[PDB]
Amino acid sequence: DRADILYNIRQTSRPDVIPTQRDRPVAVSVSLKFINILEVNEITNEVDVVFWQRTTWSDRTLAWDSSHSPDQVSVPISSLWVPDLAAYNAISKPEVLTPQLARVVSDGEVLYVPSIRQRFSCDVSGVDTESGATCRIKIGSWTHHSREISVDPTDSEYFSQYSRFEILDVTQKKNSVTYSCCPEAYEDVEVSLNFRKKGRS
Amino acid sequence: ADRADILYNIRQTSRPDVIPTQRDRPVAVSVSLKFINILEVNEITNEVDVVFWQRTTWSDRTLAWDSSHSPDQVSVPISSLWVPDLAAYNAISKPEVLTPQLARVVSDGEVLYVPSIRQRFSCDVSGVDTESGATCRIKIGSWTHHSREISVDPTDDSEYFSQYSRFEILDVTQKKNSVTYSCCPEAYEDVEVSLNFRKK
Amino acid sequence: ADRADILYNIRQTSRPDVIPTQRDRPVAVSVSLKFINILEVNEITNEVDVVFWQRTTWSDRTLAWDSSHSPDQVSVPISSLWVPDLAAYNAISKPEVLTPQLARVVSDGEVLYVPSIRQRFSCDVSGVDTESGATCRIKIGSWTHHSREISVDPTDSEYFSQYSRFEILDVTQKKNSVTYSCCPEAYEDVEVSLNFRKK
Amino acid sequence: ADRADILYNIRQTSRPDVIPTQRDRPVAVSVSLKFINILEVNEITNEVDVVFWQRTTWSDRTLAWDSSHSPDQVSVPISSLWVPDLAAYNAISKPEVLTPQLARVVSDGEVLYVPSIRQRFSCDVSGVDTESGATCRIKIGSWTHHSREISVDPDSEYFSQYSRFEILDVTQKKNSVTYSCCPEAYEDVEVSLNFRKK
Amino acid sequence: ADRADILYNIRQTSRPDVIPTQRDRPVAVSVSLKFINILEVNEITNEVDVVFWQRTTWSDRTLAWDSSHSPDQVSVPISSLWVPDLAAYNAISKPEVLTPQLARVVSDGEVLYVPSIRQRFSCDVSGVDTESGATCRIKIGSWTHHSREISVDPTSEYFSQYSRFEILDVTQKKNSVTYSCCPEAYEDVEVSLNFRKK
Ligand SMILES: O=c1c(-c2cccc(C(F)(F)F)c2)c([O-])[n+](Cc2cncnc2)c2ccccn12
Ligand SMILES: O=c1c(-c2cccc(C(F)(F)F)c2)c([O-])[n+](Cc2cncnc2)c2ccccn12
Ligand SMILES: O=c1c(-c2cccc(C(F)(F)F)c2)c([O-])[n+](Cc2cncnc2)c2ccccn12
Ligand SMILES: O=c1c(-c2cccc(C(F)(F)F)c2)c([O-])[n+](Cc2cncnc2)c2ccccn12
Ligand SMILES: O=c1c(-c2cccc(C(F)(F)F)c2)c([O-])[n+](Cc2cncnc2)c2ccccn12
What we know:
Five copies of one chain form a homopentamer. With 201 residues, chain A is mainly β. Chain A is built from one helix and twelve strands, in the order αββββββββββββ. In chain A, a hairpin with a 4-residue loop joins β1 and β2 (46-58). The longest helix of chain A has 11 residues, at 2-12. Chain A is globular. Chains in contact: A-B, A-E, B-C, C-D, D-E. Chain A binds chain B through residues 2-3, 6, 10, 35-36, 38, 50, 74-76, 79, 95-99, 101-103, 113, 115, 117, 157, 160, 162-164, and chain B through 15, 17-19, 21, 44-47, 85-87, 90-94, 122-125, 143-145, 149, 182. The structure holds ligand 7OB (5 copies). One copy of the ligand O=c1c(-c2cccc(C(F)(F)F)c2)c([O-])[n+](Cc2cncnc2)c2ccccn12 sits between chains B (32, 34, 53, 55, 57, 103-104, 112, 114) and C (143-144, 180, 182).
């Protein structure tokens, strides 16, 4: 039953241990679904956004036989390993608006979907034009290079109809960063939010 | 059995991280908002700042005790209990719980949690400064539990509403509804709360 | 018994999650506000930001010790004691506790907690800029314990900042109760009436 | 004895929740403010936002060790030590501690805590824009410990040259408060910050 | 040894509250700021709000393992590790850490911590609106560990192109503070940010 699955996850899950299988990186899939654009400052080039960060990976150490059991449970993220994802151009801490629970599937797949409100330093020039602003948000692992975490990406279906802004396009492009000190490459997703003020002349 | 024994027993049996589903039946969560205050409304950004009592009740039959010779209710910290992972889909701020985070547990295993919440929402503020007012829709449901695991059930709309708000309540309707994501067949149940209000 | 022994014994006997009801009786919680400052008033939104000392006392007789040859009082962190779940019904912010979260426990089992609280209320600010002033009513009771489990008992500008832009005309503290349609249970509150004005 | 042994001894003997009174004698807490910055002043609301180093020292002789062949000081998290429950009576914000919450424990049992605090006060800002300046009084004492348990014992060397304000004088005077109910006296330091706009 | 074994061993051996001094030598802390953004500048109050990457490295040799047949690096929560008690002497807000609080531990016992910090400083903003710009000096050192216990050593590539400011020059110079009372010297890095409005 659910209590047994959660008891077993709590005994075997190592929240502090990246679940690398053999020498393979953990494949972290990351998509933003934009829900709202709250505050835009064309002078300071800062945006306040709310997005669903759809995050999935496989931790095969969590797997169980579900032929005669539930094949999914909700688990507090404090009981699981979670990727140390960070937005490189964030200027506030991510504010998680929703309960900090992941779904764990019996094959060991983990789904985490926090609703995040966060402020970014990005190109706001053009927000009050027809072609709009393009704000680029770079999200990757802060401490795990490409041999440990790989980042995989997967338009306004969930965007508030009541925002003063409308979304023209969202592009999600794989990319990587390297710091001259070390040979290590860190994978990121570059998310390009092309948006503008509604109801211009 | 005295209060200390009831709380000792809850601490031994309660599994805060385990939904109390009885066989494969969903946990029936009842959710009502009582609006207490409307603090800030922005017609331009379509954002409201409200204070509401979220009356939340469910059954966790693993907590039940014989109360023929004991108290039939205790106050328990929610950190000792399983609580539904309810979230407002159109919230744009964290829920600010203004009150002590205690539930009442009844000897039949019923749990009552009534946080006073201050939160900001993105919703329709058009018409707020007119006679017929705005209608702001607040969608609250389980974030991670689909309809087979949690079912959400709604139940004098300004009985507790501050007479000192700049706004007044015309009507509150509470309608059952559900959300579904393209990927998956799973339905997540919500209550849609329709707050019809206006400037005084 | 020295201070370390009194604190060791409180830590063994205190159940922070268990209301200390003696022989089925409600716990008698005594609550007074002493207003220290009025920081921001908004006559348009009807909101006030205040600083007050919330003098709170009750009896937990399970904590009592023989003090004929011992200290008759210690300071204890409130995380080691049961504390009443008091809330202000018309608060629009969390209480911001400005002071160390310590109670005094007396050898007879009396507990004194006096947090300095900064909090915002929704209340009547009309008249603040007149001679007779505004009357802001702050309703404080137990959130979860009805009258058979907690009773709230009350007891003006002696400690009010001389440097506030406002001054206090009168504070009245009256017992009252709330009851919900659903249930016969009554929840006790103190209504505190702060009559103040701009200087 | 290495640092880990000194800290393991402190950790096993220190009772964070127990005031270290020797027999019936109060703990002598020494408190000085060193003003670092005056950030915001409001002559209408009479409110000041200040940054100060709160130099705090007392003795816990039960922690002492022989340091003839050992370090004579360690840094210890304050959560492992008893710390005086000091509060500013005219504070209108919670103290924002800007620095790591570590004390120094010296081998004779002296404890030194020097948090950098940013806090807002309700105090006399009248005269700030004049040559003789404002005098803002900050009362700091034990919140819960009367004079038989804690006694409190008391200018621009470190004041930011980039403040809009400058310090004319800091006075630190011992004082005490008493509540009508009870015979108990609570000791405080009154700190008088005489300052003005430059 | 796999990752789980190395992290289990670090968790068993780490002493978060014990400075890892090797022999009687100070711990060599290396500190560089990489400026990412300048958010708010106030030429009247002389206050700046900045975002920087604080590159911090030191050695804790007790954490070391044989990595000839193992991963030579893991990510560890800083709450499991000793971390230098670094503070900015002219900060006027708490450091706001924007990134996951994880360090890298290398098999030789080297620890790398790179928090992204947003913090407000009191410093010289005069000249920000001119061609030669302002020079804002940020002093960062150990708050509680003198020069015999911690030594601090320094060494627009990542600066946002979308700031309304631009960086002309960053200087990182070793320095020290001493308090008249005591012979103890506290080592700091003085970081000189020369910047201007675009
Ligand atoms: O967008 C989603 C998704 C979702 C949709 C598609 C793909 C993915 C995946 F992750 F695959 F990319 C996740 C979704 O599943 N939940 C339910 C959920 C949440 N947390 C954990 N488990 C389930 C919610 C709930 C609220 C809002 C958006 N939610
Ligand atoms: O600037 C850096 C560095 C870095 C670069 C040069 C020197 C040093 C050292 F440490 F040598 F000074 C560290 C870097 O390594 N990581 C990876 C990292 C993060 N946290 C902990 N350890 C490593 C990141 C990651 C994100 C942004 C900037 N990062
Ligand atoms: O609205 C309520 C209710 C209440 C009323 C009717 C239905 C429900 C239920 F929950 F049934 F829907 C709950 C109520 O009970 N408490 C007391 C309480 C609080 N928390 C926990 N248990 C009880 C309070 C207390 C303060 C303010 C509003 N309170
Ligand atoms: O008002 C008071 C009181 C006090 C005065 C009268 C009645 C009561 C009682 F509580 F009886 F109603 C308490 C007072 O006692 N302390 C000391 C104290 C503090 N906290 C805990 N215990 C004691 C302080 C300390 C600072 C400011 C105001 N304080
Ligand atoms: O002003 C001081 C002092 C100091 C100076 C004189 C008297 C006292 C005492 F406390 F004796 F009154 C303490 C000083 O020592 N430290 C080092 C220190 C820090 N924290 C804890 N212990 C020591 C610092 C560190 C930074 C800034 C100012 N610091």
